[PDB]
Amino acid sequence: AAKNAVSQFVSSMSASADVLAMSKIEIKLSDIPEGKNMAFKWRGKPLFV
Amino acid sequence: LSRFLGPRYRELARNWIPTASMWGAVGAVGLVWATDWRLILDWVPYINGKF
Amino acid sequence: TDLELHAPSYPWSHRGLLSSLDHTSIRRGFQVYKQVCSSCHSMDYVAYRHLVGVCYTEEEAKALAEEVEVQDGPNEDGEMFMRPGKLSDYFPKPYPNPEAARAANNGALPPDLSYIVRARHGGEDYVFSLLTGYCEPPTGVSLREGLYFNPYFPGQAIAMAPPIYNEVLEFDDGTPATMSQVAKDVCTFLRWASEPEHDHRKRMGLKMLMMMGLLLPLVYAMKRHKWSVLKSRKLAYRPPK
Amino acid sequence: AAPTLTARLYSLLFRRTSTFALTIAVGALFFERAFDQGADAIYEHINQGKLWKHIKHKYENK
Amino acid sequence: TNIRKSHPLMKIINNAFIDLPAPSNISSWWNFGSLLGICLILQILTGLFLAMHYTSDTTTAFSSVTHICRDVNYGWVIRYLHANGASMFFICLFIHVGRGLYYGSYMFLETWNIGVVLLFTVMATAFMGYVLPWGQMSFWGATVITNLLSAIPYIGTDLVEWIWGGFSVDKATLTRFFAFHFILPFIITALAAVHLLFLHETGSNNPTGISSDMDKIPFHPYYTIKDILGALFMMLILLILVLFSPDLLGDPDNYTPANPLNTPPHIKPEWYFLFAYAILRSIPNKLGGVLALVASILILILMPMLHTSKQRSMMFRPLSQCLFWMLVADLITLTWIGGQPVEHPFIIIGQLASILYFLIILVLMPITSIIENNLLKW
Amino acid sequence: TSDTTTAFSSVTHICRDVNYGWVIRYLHANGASMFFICLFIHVGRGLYYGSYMF
Amino acid sequence: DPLTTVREQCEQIEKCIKARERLELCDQRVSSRSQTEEDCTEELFDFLHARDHCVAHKLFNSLK
Amino acid sequence: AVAASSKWLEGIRKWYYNAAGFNKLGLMRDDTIYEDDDVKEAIRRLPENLYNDRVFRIKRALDLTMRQQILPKEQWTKYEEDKFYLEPYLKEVIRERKEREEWAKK
Amino acid sequence: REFGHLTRMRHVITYSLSPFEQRAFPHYFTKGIPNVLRRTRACILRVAPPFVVFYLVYTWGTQEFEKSKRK
């Protein structure tokens, strides 16, 4: 009985945090132009493509 | 040291290495369940608690 | 591996201990920013509600809100119209977005001017020594098409073009508008913007050195007259012979 | 025997706790107005001019 | 009858500080425990308004701080209390811990071990706090340490994703760091009523070593009016520093606004972690470095079991007096070195200085105490 | 968020947006409809078994 | 303008002439051959530091 | 272990006696030891004239320290007039403890 | 562990005096000043030598870093 009630609390505030879905699975295909390294506010640290 | 040197403390040690061994085994296995430790949760495929 | 020059120390009228900021170099310093610096730099944290009692009277700076009218947002059926502006409104920002700056200014985003004082080693004497410095390139150093030489700047080559010289501005008073005094009255305006607290707190540090003074040798007296019983006791030991 | 300042001071208002407690309340009241006035004045005189008051006479009564 | 004695509630405060035996010759170096008690208590009342008006969001992270300074009534006063009342807290704590060692105070097994747990707990609270303001040093400490706990042999990879609550620092960051930096104070006011309950059964020590039951003295009024004088003298120093020269201690790199892109030129921490940073940087490789940084807090525990002496404390011991001062002089050479680049000549002194922190404790104080025993025949 | 024009949308995003938040919102709203159940029983009994002489 | 008058007044003291003497010696050697390495930024740095140190005591007096 | 150097061991022992400073408070070497469970036993095996003295040399030299002073120079405990009063009662509490412990071993 | 149960003690006497019958500063500048003297004297022969060393290394290290860039 004491298993689920803690397995759920472990993931409530974590496990992609529920705000991480958008650009790891995102469909942008390099909004950055050719030859430049533009920074995106995704992946926590800026994403570069 | 010398207060603890003897055969009787070594005998208690070999008598209660069952206690230490079971204590450590239970603690180690419990430390897998407690922190959602997938890395040993997979060493046995019998606990499919990850949904 | 290049060395950096450190600005010296000057005798400001607000330098230490108990001395304040004279509100005339600041009254004469917004204008030097207003008619020179602003069309590129932002002052977003700084708003017109602030200057009601430091440099200008309430309506005197109110009239500076009508000089430029800011673009507005959503209102009824004809939004994106223009409003004359009032007391609340902030220092109008030059571009639509900051990303326009790299377009016109060679890919060099201008630093904001709200904290430029505190964010630098040196302080209000690094900026002043920057302004009058601009010098000659020595023998044997190449530069880009759009770069300038300054022995204070860490790279020794800055995009910005010297914005102060003789007869740049007309002071409303008639003091000789010279490079030497325009630079000083800019280094005074920005400092007060970095802190609006620099003068209120020099006055709570003098009325407190007096409460401590009165109360910190009266607790010492009580303490001393409980430990005298304890500090003047003699003692025996005659044992049985 | 000669009347010391504290000799008649201890008799009148220092005995029980009661007048020992009245004066502590009243003592601060006759103290805060004197202490407030003579503290700001030195702030002005040390560096007068520079402040905003000593120039705003340029804008008064037209 | 006597009310205090017979009431069920007053009966408890009467045995704790009104009426307990206390030694006659207690000095002023015994005043710091109560200062810490005072010091801990400011930080919770301050830190209340810094979340009440505080906003937990990623986009406003830099801007929430500069906002609260000017707009909020009496906000410029209270903000610099939280940052300056926490550099006080760490100078009444290296004085307290140092004092006990000199006078042999670690022979309380119960209380010298509940105290080394309190020393890890307040290190953590401080190190989240630097990382809330977000500006171009909070971010560039966070990467350094957070990355390096990824060199754990089998678990390090799995941990940096949980604390991030994402790939990396993200909006969730305000949610967690605030969450764990908020929690920490309230576990520390619990291990302090237990740190003191194990001491009410032996009483205090005194700067002589010998045990003194033939002249005790109550605790009132003799150390409840020496403790007040102490605390007042302290409000005086804490207030010279925020109404005259607040900015003397920080670094002018913090302000530069929130940018992932920009490069901080000269990374380095706040002044009371600069002896930790000089250890980690002194040794090649990822895995051996983290082990040399936990070693020091963990070394205090080997304390009572290295004691070789007939006397307790260093008061009557000349030879062992001198070393004391060496360990201290050599913890001032790890604060200067750690706030600079690796350097051409700063690597050789820089990692000679560190081992010695280790050599004296583990080899030279046990040996030297024996020559004292042998030299006056025990 | 104690924003007078941000407060209501806050609970509206929590009871949609995050993992298991719909459970926790309702335990907090219902677990005090019963803490107030307990009170009326623990009190009324002390007016049966003479429990005020304490 | 008042700065323009004082700079040469403050260059008069011999604390700043010596480093000035040093600047020319390498300056002509560098320009004599395009094969030299030194860039006189260093010898420049001594001269400005000494000059601008002595300007500080006075310029605020000789203002308005 | 040395004989011709035993003059030097005496020389270093008279210097370390003065550098440590319990004689300026009147104490004696046995007054300073640390009281554990084995020194707490050997104290209640003392006659009464020896035990009463020890409680006055420890109360007069813990009052001079509350006042941050030291006793006049004519009353300093000399080197060749310190008598080890608690030594013999302490070798005996110890060697009776090595005996109760090698019985549990054999 | 209260006052009536701590130790046993014999033939000794004490001679206190009131607080309202005496003075708090008998001799303030004639005793305190020679006092601080013997104190510090006796002890600043084993507290200073360690801190001279940190000064010698400090001046040797900034000297080297400076002359490796500025020739």
Ligand code: HEC
């Ligand atoms: C649009 C032209 C322009 C003018 C005219 C102008 N600024 Fe600048 N300002 C800039 C740019 C561009 C930079 C630096 C951007 C960079 O180096 O990336 C800058 C930098 C600065 C700096 C910091 C200098 C440094 O070294 O970091 C200050 C302060 C400043 N501006 C304020 C002013 C002041 C004061 C004036 C009037 C003397 C002024 N601006 C006039 C665009 C301008």
Ligand code: HEM
């Ligand atoms: C030993 C106790 C504490 C220490 C040492 C400590 C330390 C710090 C430090 C060093 C900062 C850096 C911020 C700056 O530089 O201005 C900070 C920020 C902060 N602290 Fe604490 N703190 C303590 C207790 C608390 C408590 C109890 C709270 C309760 C809410 C709290 C809440 C905050 C908050 C909200 C910030 C926000 C960052 C900012 O506003 O600058 N702290 N703390």
Ligand code: HEM
């Ligand atoms: C929040 C942190 C702490 C608080 C509030 C605290 C508080 C106190 C207080 C109030 C005392 C009362 C006795 C006195 O004032 O001398 C005391 C004693 C003591 N403390 Fe702490 N302390 C803290 C941290 C530590 C740490 C880190 C240690 C590390 C070893 C420690 C070890 C001791 C010891 C050994 C004593 C024994 C007193 C003696 O020698 O007589 N404490 N402490």
